[PDB]
Amino acid sequence: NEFLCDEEIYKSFVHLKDKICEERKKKELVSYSSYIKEMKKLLKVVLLKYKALKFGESNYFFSSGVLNNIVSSNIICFLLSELILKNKLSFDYLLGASYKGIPMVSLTSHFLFESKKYSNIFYLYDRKNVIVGNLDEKKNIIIIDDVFTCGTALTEILAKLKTYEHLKVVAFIVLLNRNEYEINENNQKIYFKDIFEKRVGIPLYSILSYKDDIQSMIH
Amino acid sequence: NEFLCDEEIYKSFVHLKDKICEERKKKELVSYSSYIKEMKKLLKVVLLKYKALKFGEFISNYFFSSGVLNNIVSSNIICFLLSELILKNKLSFDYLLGASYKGIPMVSLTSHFLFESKKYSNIFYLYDRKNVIVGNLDDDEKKNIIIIDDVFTCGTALTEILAKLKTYEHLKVVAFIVLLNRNEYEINENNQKIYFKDIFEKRVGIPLYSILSYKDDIQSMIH
């Protein structure tokens, strides 16, 4: 048994969470970034421990089902909440993409609520009546999901939401962006994230990325 | 408008959550019960404020919908109390399973309140789709599951989850916990009410617990 035990993970989560909040309040950006990076290290340990990441022939596989435990989801949902606060994203609703986003959205709401900036936080989810929650000049939605490859899943949710005239999506937040790309006529990588952001006019944020976080696990 | 504002609801939730935990730790049962009953009052105010309860005539004299409870001020109270049912009744479990869809955002947050008890090194939660059970499974001794859902009428929805779980040989359900039991019944040959809860418990051999019940909590709202 080769990884930090859950009791140690939690202790480290608590310490890092306190420092990250403290530094955000003090507006010390360099320290904030650094403590975020430490939390991301802890999260990568978790991903390996619970085997959310597996290696060997893509050269890695990612599954979020093994992250449905509170010690793991605390880290994840805390960091989703931090992306919202750090980037000062304004919203009326958070929407958890079915199914993986759904247990994330309540718990992320819980971490946001600790900022004391909100009198409540209203969250939604989509089935497969297709949008459920406290509904009915445009209301703004941030969508949460686990993984971004080409944007196929987020595009389907956008289709469901096009029906609802008074709703607008203003951001996507995700645990992992795979940094997928296509090569163009000049032998340059054109990333799906950039193509997707351009097509739908909405920014995507991610806790982790293949390039910054996963590739250094490969060897 | 006519109801406590969300800031006040939260302040009251915090106060009552602290007293409830304190009294459970001290094993003062009468005080614990009493503070639970205060939280239930607050929850009833929430159900009326967000119109999770509506009155008149439906297909019964009240209608219940949990979609308006998907906000943290309301789900705090609900999920806290689901956690307290687990603790108070000393229910042992390896997993919590949130019934799709309503139970799913409840299960993580209920896991969060359980985790505050410091009895657990982690809490592992599941959910079903409609491959069919998602979470930290190795499994196809038995692992124990408590199922969480919003409303119990005859048990049709819980029965469907049991069917999905029958495939998994190493899993066993040891309790159902629910926000509301409607206390539905049939009348028998002696003009006695036989409750679906009792019939359901007997058929599947698994206890059901509920935060609220029609008889104890909702009837007095009617007039």
Numbering used by the authors:
A (entry chain B): 7 to 36, 59 to 85, 94 to 164, 173 to 180, 200 to 282
B (entry chain A): 7 to 36, 59 to 87, 94 to 164, 173 to 182, 200 to 282
Question: What does the publication say?
Answer:
Specifically, P. falciparum orotate phosphoribosyltransferase (PfOPRTase), the fifth enzyme in the indispensible de novo pyrimidine-synthesis pathway of the parasite, is of special interest. OPRTase catalyses the conversion of orotate and 5-phospho-d-ribosyl 1-pyrophosphate (PRPP) into orotidine 5′-monophosphate (OMP). OPRTase is a dimeric enzyme with two active-site pockets, one on each protomer. Once the substrate has docked, two different loops, one from each protomer, cover the bound substrate to shield it from solvent.
In our crystal, PfOPRTase 1–218(Δ37–58)-H6 packs as a set of four catalytic dimers, leading to eight molecules in the asymmetric unit. In the present crystal, the individual PfOPRTase molecules possess the conserved α/β topology also seen in other OPRTases. The PfOPRTase structure conforms with the conserved PRTase fold, having a 321456 arrangement of β-sheets. There are 2–6 sulfate ions originating from the crystallization conditions associated with each polypeptide in the core dimer. The two most interesting sulfate ions occupy the positions where the phosphate and pyrophosphate groups of the PRPP substrate are expected to bind. Remarkably, of the 11 active-site residues at the core of the human enzyme, five are different in the malarial enzyme. In this larger tetrameric structure, a protomer from one catalytic dimer forms an inhibitory interaction with the active site of another protomer but from a different neighboring catalytic dimer. A β-hairpin formed by β8 and β9 (243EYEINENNQKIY254) inserts itself exactly at the substrate-binding pocket of the recipient active site. This completely occludes the closure of the hood domain and would prevent crucial substrate interactions, including π-stacking with Phe97, in the hood domain. Presumably, these intersubunit interactions blocking the active site of PfOPRTase occurred at high crystallization concentrations, but they hint at protein–protein interactions leading to autologous catalytic inhibition of PfOPRTase that may regulate flux through this enzyme.
